[PDB]
Amino acid sequence: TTIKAAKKMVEREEAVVWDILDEVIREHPVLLNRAPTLHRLGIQAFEPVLIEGKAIQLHPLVCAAYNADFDGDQMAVHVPLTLEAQLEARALMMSTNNILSPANGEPIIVPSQDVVLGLYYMTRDCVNAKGEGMVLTGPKEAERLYR
Amino acid sequence: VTEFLKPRLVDIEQVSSTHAKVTLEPLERGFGHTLGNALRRILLSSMPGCAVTEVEIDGVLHEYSTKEGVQEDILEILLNLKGLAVRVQGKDEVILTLNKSGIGPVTAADITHDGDVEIVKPQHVICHLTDENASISMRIKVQRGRGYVPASTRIHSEEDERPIGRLLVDACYSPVERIAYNVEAARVEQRTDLDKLVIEMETNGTIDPEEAIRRAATILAEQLEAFVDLRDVRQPEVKEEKPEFDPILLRPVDDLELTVRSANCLKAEAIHYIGDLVQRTEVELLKTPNLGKKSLTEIKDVLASRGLSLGMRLENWPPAS
Amino acid sequence: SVTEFLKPRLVDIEQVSSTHAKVTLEPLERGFGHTLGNALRRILLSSMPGCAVTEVEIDGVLHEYSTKEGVQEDILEILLNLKGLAVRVQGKDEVILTLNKSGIGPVTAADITHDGDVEIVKPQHVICHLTDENASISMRIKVQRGRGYVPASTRIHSEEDERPIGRLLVDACYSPVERIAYNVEAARVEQRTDLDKLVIEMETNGTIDPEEAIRRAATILAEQLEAFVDLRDVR
Amino acid sequence: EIKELLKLGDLPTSGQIRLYDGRTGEQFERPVTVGYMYMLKLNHLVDDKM
Amino acid sequence: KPLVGTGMERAVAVDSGVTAVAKRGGVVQYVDASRIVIKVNEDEMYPGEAGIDIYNLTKYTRSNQNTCINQMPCVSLGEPVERGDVLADGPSTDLGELAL
Amino acid sequence: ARVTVQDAVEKIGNRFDLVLVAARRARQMQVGGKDPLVPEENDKTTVIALREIEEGLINNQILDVRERQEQQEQEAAEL
Ligand SMILES: [Mg+2]
Questions:
Q1: Cβ of C72 and E70 within 8 Å?
Q2: Which chain E residues touch C68 with a CB distance below 8 Å?
Q3: Residue A78: its H or E element
Q4: CA-CA-CA-CA torsion for A36, A39, A41, A43, nearest 10 degrees?
Q5: C-alpha distances in Å from residue B256, one per residue of A64, A83, C93, C106, C110
Q6: Taking the domains of chain F in order of start, what are their residue ranges?
Q7: Are A89 and A45 in contact (CB under 8 A)?
Q8: Which of A24, A105, A131, C57 has a CB 3.0–4.6 Å from the CB of C140, allowing a cystine?
Q9: To which H or E segment does residue C203 belong?
Q10: If we measure between CA atoms, which residue out of A35, A94, A95 comes closest to residue A67?
């Protein structure tokens, strides 16, 4: 009913506040920022999902644009706090709306080493292996036969 | 608590009526992975069904043949046959014929209709036929197998006899065509993470995807029945049998939180076991030397604080020593 | 037959040691070998009824970052050794044991005051070392049965259980199993080919019984299954 | 020298051992290397950074 | 103990003042988590006003980087020790060998 | 929910006027007391505003027309 009761409940962190926190971050994005900021991609917008821990889980395909390795880099988070701000972050500063670098038309979401190595191993064909020369109907049957 | 959690599904999407997306929430931190893996390994191979297993063309006796009357090679014919699903009754093996000519393409509806079998998709195109002068016929034998039989075991079964030069098709007795399970994080009021499972499956349409899920679950339950607690609870019966004398009495007096002084004083009277001391009123203590205030207080504290007291009348002692 | 195949059955719980045991599931038709092996391994590694120590109490020391004149090791080493100790309780779910020792020597599990339903899996497990004649240790050890694993931090519920300074909290790491390996091999059958017998070896704490733990894991998996079996839109 | 020390024990000489997946329970192809490495926890704990 | 060592660890742990070094080789008399009392051998003992040596191990105290520094005894009663040998492993040490 | 706004940029001239009209719609829906013309799915005002803009029935001209209409209604009620 008042601010004091809500503050006490938040401090106690009862089972009735976690769903409220999940609801308020249903579609409320935040801003992730790298410590040295070089270009527009130094600050991006992202929809947060709650995780139990003390660290910020980041998408692998954007850290490359962030030039942020995972050897102990620390990044900052900011809140829009305003309807105009939330709409702008969802419309302009969102990661999906920034896939081409402002410098060159090359896509800044180029895949990194792990995914490309996996795909290269998946596509690098040999001369002789299990099932060489058979016939498959569709990709689903191929995946079934492989798994 | 030794009491696990049971999931409650909240989404069974039946898009396209032949590809299902089921959810499961919530599970524990590691049950989703193992459940998805087991269900996938079951539905891939160990899932009984029916599919084409033998094919014989009346004019072609080899997988490689420049066959006229059709604009497709024999490989495409075998592929379309493998892609043809059919459900058969208790008869675990049945042949059918495809005696048909014409102008357009022969489909699954042109198969000789028999009450012993049932085609799932009559409109499923089989083979494009030449518009004129093309009277081709082929027989197809289906059986009730266990799962996928690749071209290796297939060519082995060929190597068995192959007396006529019988053609062959890749047998896929598993009714499901593809399946993929994915685990994600689900949150309870204060639980860290739980395995929310999402299974996207797609079958040959011969059975419902939820029906195949239920069948795989039942087959795994039947497999595990051998060791399901031997019962529901295996112990709906409790029985409390207790003698009058307590087992603490048989233990020595040295296990009662007593100092070395009190231990030596109690051993001075040759009272080793506790039962030899509970049957002795304190009148026989202050008369014993080296039993003053500290020793007596410590004894009366560390002896009667455990529920019993000092000095009682019993006869069942010592059983059995 | 082509359909309606058989079901496995336990035939041996032969143990090569007091803890390292081996079981043999047989027979399995095809593909069920690896499936059941991985399933049972994950169920055993995930959570099984354990009986590790949860709360300790020593009259002398007040906090785990202190010492005591008479004991060789430190309080933290004592807590580590107690966590490494295993015990089996049958009747109740939580119990309090008392350990009273004196004189120079290696104080091990055999020096504690046992009870009826309390069984020590190994008395040779060293706890500490008394390096002084006029030195004594009298301690209380709380052991409760749980499911899984919980650290000493998240287990707090109120602010009165820690008010007694002598009460110290150790992470409740209860897990009867420690390593579970499995392998399929050619099973001996009456007349057929390609049947998989699954040999499962388990290096455990020796507290739980191999057959009992296997049946409990099977029942847990089957309960999860049966919850998954009769699927229908219910909320 | 490392090869002969490994062959002294029953460990494989190639240093790469076949590994099984913890989730799927299947065999990892391309035998992965595995050994014992000495590691250090740096003085950059997260509890003083978040 | 680090498995793949360099041999130099056997010096950095003793050349520094982190562990308890033996000023005089003698026989162990009293082992305790707080103090260690050694009886000096007859030859190394001074011919007059001599006695036994005592090393007061430091317990958990705050360091200059908010880290714990503690010495743990690694000797047994009656075990003869030589001069310069390690008696108690300090923080991040194991039997007179650096273990980070 | 909403992941991409490219179609909104196709429907509106640019992104600045797009976000301006979306903010106006969000202010009208949250504190203005206006009902959403599209059935929501547990979404905030911004998401439903973007959805109604993408459906093509709400833009700057339509919002100005609605403002003029509510003004006319105010004056008609004042009579
Ligand atoms: Mg870096």
A1: no
A2: 33
A3: strand A76-78
A4: 50
A5: 69, 72, 23, 22, 16
A6: 1-79
A7: yes
A8: C57
A9: strand C196-204
A10: A35
Mode of pairing for the β-strands spanning C9-10 and B176-186:
unpaired
Q: What is the DSSP letter of C152?
A: T
The closest alpha carbon to C131, from E39, E80, E76, belongs to E76
Per the CATH hierarchy, to which homologous superfamily does domain B50-172 belong?
A: DNA-directed RNA polymerase, insert domain (2.170.120.12)
What are the φ and ψ backbone dihedral angles of E84, each rounded to 5 degrees? 85, -10
How far is it, in rounded angstroms, from Cα A27 to Cα A22?
Answer: 10
CB B266 within 8 A of CB B289: no
Q: How far is the C-alpha of B53 from the C-alpha of F43, rounded, in Å? A: 53
CB B38 within 8 A of CB B46: no
Residue from A70, A69, A62, A72 nearest A41 by CA? A62
Interface of F with A (CB under 8 A): 1-6, 8, 15, 18-19, 22-23, 26-27, 30, 42-47, 49-50
CA pair distance C144, B83, nearest whole angstrom: 58
Residue F53, both tokens: 């803009």
What are the φ/ψ torsions at residue F20 (nearest 5 degrees)? -65, -45
Taking the C-alpha atoms of residue E85 and residue F63, their distance in angstroms, rounded to an integer, is 87
- What six digits make up the tokens of C199? 């040999």
Nearest-angstrom CA–CA distance, A25 and A15: 17
Report which of C38, C2, C14 is spatially closest to residue C210, judged by C-alpha positions: C14
Residue linked to tokens 């050694």: E38
- What's the token pair of residue E49? 């006003």
Count Cβ atoms below 10 Å from residue B101 Cβ, excluding itself. Answer: 14
- Tell me, yes or no, if B33 comes closer than 8 A to chain D by beta carbon: yes
Q: Please judge whether E73 and C72 are an interchain contact, meaning their C-beta atoms are less than 8 angstroms apart.
A: yes
Domain topology for C49-169: RNA Polymerase Alpha Subunit; Chain A, domain 2 (2.170.120)
Secondary-structure breakdown of chain A: helix, strand, coil percentages, each rounded to the nearest 5: 35, 10, 55
Residue A54 distance to chain D (closest CA, Å):
6
- Assigned token pair, B33: 């992975």
Resolution at which this structure was determined, Å: 4.0
**F3: closest CA among B186, A45, B11?**
A45
First to last CA, chain D: 47
Is the torsion defined by CA of C174, C176, C181, C187 positive or negative? negative
β-pairing verdict for E20-21 and C136-144: unpaired
CA angle E24, E30, E33 (to 5 degrees): 105
Find how far residue F26's CA is from the centre of its chain. 6
What DSSP string runs through B192-246?
S-EEEEEEEEEE-SSS-HHHHHHHHHHHHHHHHGGGSTTSSSS---------SS-
Contact between C127 and C108 under an 8 Å Cβ cutoff? The reply is yes
